[PDB]
Amino acid sequence: GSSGSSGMATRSCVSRGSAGSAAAGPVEAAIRAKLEQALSPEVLELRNESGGHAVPAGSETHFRVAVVSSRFEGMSPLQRHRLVHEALSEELAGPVHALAIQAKTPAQWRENPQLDISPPCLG
């Protein structure tokens, strides 16, 4: 068992219908990885909400992101989203249909760095 050689997965996975393992996904990650280099805020939080309507697991239409950059320093509430939306225009125009984007500043975050994407239902 020496490394170097070129192996291969070679393993039938098989899984159709409902798939959504591991936290986040390739879409969400991007939404972040993007804004990450498309804004490079001080605090970029993102997670899967999928809670409200009557949709089965896997639905990645509703999302919540928390961006913390100075870009939105005394800016409009629309512009903020626009900025992101602009970077991830395909997101809002494809998979994501409506995601609550949190546009804050590195000055305000400090005040209330506590987000609110979910209720206090922890244990």
Side-chain angles (χ1 to χ4, degrees):
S2 213
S3 240
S5 64
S6 195
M8 265 235 151
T10 286
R11 203 166 123 278
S12 205
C13 292
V14 171
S15 62
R16 57 257 257 191
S18 182
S21 216
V27 174
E28 183 199 318
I31 298 184
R32 191 232 235 70
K34 287 245 190 118
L35 303 170
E36 267 204 323
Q37 64 173 14
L39 299 164
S40 82
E42 297 260 279
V43 191
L44 232 167
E45 283 272 315
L46 183 53
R47 271 104 198 276
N48 187 272
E49 302 294 319
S50 153
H53 36 197
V55 287
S59 22
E60 265 174 274
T61 49
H62 238 260
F63 263 128
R64 234 154 244 274
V65 89
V67 69
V68 175
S69 237
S70 45
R71 293 264 50 84
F72 319 116
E73 260 239 280
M75 272 237 295
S76 259
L78 271 150
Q79 289 200 263
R80 286 160 183 187
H81 289 217
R82 192 219 190 178
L83 249 105
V84 168
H85 280 205
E86 245 217 287
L88 284 318
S89 231
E90 277 214 66
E91 303 300 85
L92 279 314
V96 194
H97 287 204
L99 108 79
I101 305 183
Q102 230 120 304
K104 317 231 185 204
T105 33
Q108 307 279 88
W109 175 263
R110 292 195 117 196
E111 259 253 299
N112 207 245
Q114 311 146 18
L115 296 150
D116 271 288
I117 63 182
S118 249
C121 198
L122 72 145

PDB file of all heavy atoms in Angstrom, residues 5-13:
ATOM      1  N   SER A   5       0.821   5.981  -6.688  1.00  0.00           N
ATOM      2  CA  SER A   5       0.051   5.339  -7.740  1.00  0.00           C
ATOM      3  C   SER A   5      -1.293   6.048  -7.912  1.00  0.00           C
ATOM      4  O   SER A   5      -1.812   6.638  -6.966  1.00  0.00           O
ATOM      5  CB  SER A   5      -0.167   3.855  -7.436  1.00  0.00           C
ATOM      6  OG  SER A   5      -0.952   3.660  -6.264  1.00  0.00           O
ATOM      7  N   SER A   6      -1.818   5.968  -9.126  1.00  0.00           N
ATOM      8  CA  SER A   6      -3.092   6.595  -9.433  1.00  0.00           C
ATOM      9  C   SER A   6      -4.225   5.577  -9.289  1.00  0.00           C
ATOM     10  O   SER A   6      -4.394   4.705 -10.141  1.00  0.00           O
ATOM     11  CB  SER A   6      -3.088   7.188 -10.844  1.00  0.00           C
ATOM     12  OG  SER A   6      -4.174   8.088 -11.047  1.00  0.00           O
ATOM     13  N   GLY A   7      -4.973   5.720  -8.205  1.00  0.00           N
ATOM     14  CA  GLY A   7      -6.085   4.824  -7.938  1.00  0.00           C
ATOM     15  C   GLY A   7      -7.383   5.367  -8.541  1.00  0.00           C
ATOM     16  O   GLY A   7      -7.351   6.166  -9.475  1.00  0.00           O
ATOM     17  N   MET A   8      -8.493   4.909  -7.982  1.00  0.00           N
ATOM     18  CA  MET A   8      -9.800   5.338  -8.453  1.00  0.00           C
ATOM     19  C   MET A   8     -10.894   4.960  -7.453  1.00  0.00           C
ATOM     20  O   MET A   8     -10.826   3.907  -6.821  1.00  0.00           O
ATOM     21  CB  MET A   8     -10.095   4.685  -9.805  1.00  0.00           C
ATOM     22  CG  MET A   8      -9.711   5.614 -10.958  1.00  0.00           C
ATOM     23  SD  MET A   8     -11.110   5.851 -12.042  1.00  0.00           S
ATOM     24  CE  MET A   8     -10.756   7.491 -12.651  1.00  0.00           C
ATOM     25  N   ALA A   9     -11.878   5.841  -7.340  1.00  0.00           N
ATOM     26  CA  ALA A   9     -12.985   5.612  -6.428  1.00  0.00           C
ATOM     27  C   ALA A   9     -13.502   4.184  -6.608  1.00  0.00           C
ATOM     28  O   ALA A   9     -13.425   3.371  -5.687  1.00  0.00           O
ATOM     29  CB  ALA A   9     -14.072   6.661  -6.673  1.00  0.00           C
ATOM     30  N   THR A  10     -14.019   3.920  -7.799  1.00  0.00           N
ATOM     31  CA  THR A  10     -14.548   2.603  -8.111  1.00  0.00           C
ATOM     32  C   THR A  10     -15.421   2.094  -6.963  1.00  0.00           C
ATOM     33  O   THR A  10     -14.982   1.268  -6.163  1.00  0.00           O
ATOM     34  CB  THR A  10     -13.369   1.683  -8.432  1.00  0.00           C
ATOM     35  OG1 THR A  10     -12.938   2.109  -9.723  1.00  0.00           O
ATOM     36  CG2 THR A  10     -13.800   0.231  -8.644  1.00  0.00           C
ATOM     37  N   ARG A  11     -16.641   2.608  -6.916  1.00  0.00           N
ATOM     38  CA  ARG A  11     -17.580   2.215  -5.879  1.00  0.00           C
ATOM     39  C   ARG A  11     -18.972   2.770  -6.184  1.00  0.00           C
ATOM     40  O   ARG A  11     -19.168   3.984  -6.218  1.00  0.00           O
ATOM     41  CB  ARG A  11     -17.127   2.720  -4.507  1.00  0.00           C
ATOM     42  CG  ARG A  11     -17.738   1.879  -3.384  1.00  0.00           C
ATOM     43  CD  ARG A  11     -17.026   2.138  -2.055  1.00  0.00           C
ATOM     44  NE  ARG A  11     -18.001   2.587  -1.037  1.00  0.00           N
ATOM     45  CZ  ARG A  11     -18.434   3.850  -0.917  1.00  0.00           C
ATOM     46  NH1 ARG A  11     -17.981   4.796  -1.751  1.00  0.00           N
ATOM     47  NH2 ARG A  11     -19.321   4.166   0.036  1.00  0.00           N
ATOM     48  N   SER A  12     -19.905   1.855  -6.401  1.00  0.00           N
ATOM     49  CA  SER A  12     -21.274   2.237  -6.703  1.00  0.00           C
ATOM     50  C   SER A  12     -21.914   2.900  -5.481  1.00  0.00           C
ATOM     51  O   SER A  12     -22.014   2.287  -4.420  1.00  0.00           O
ATOM     52  CB  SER A  12     -22.099   1.027  -7.144  1.00  0.00           C
ATOM     53  OG  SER A  12     -23.209   1.404  -7.955  1.00  0.00           O
ATOM     54  N   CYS A  13     -22.329   4.143  -5.672  1.00  0.00           N
ATOM     55  CA  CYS A  13     -22.956   4.896  -4.599  1.00  0.00           C
ATOM     56  C   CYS A  13     -24.463   4.630  -4.642  1.00  0.00           C
ATOM     57  O   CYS A  13     -25.029   4.095  -3.691  1.00  0.00           O
ATOM     58  CB  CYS A  13     -22.638   6.390  -4.694  1.00  0.00           C
ATOM     59  SG  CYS A  13     -20.861   6.673  -4.362  1.00  0.00           S
TER      60      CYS A  13
END
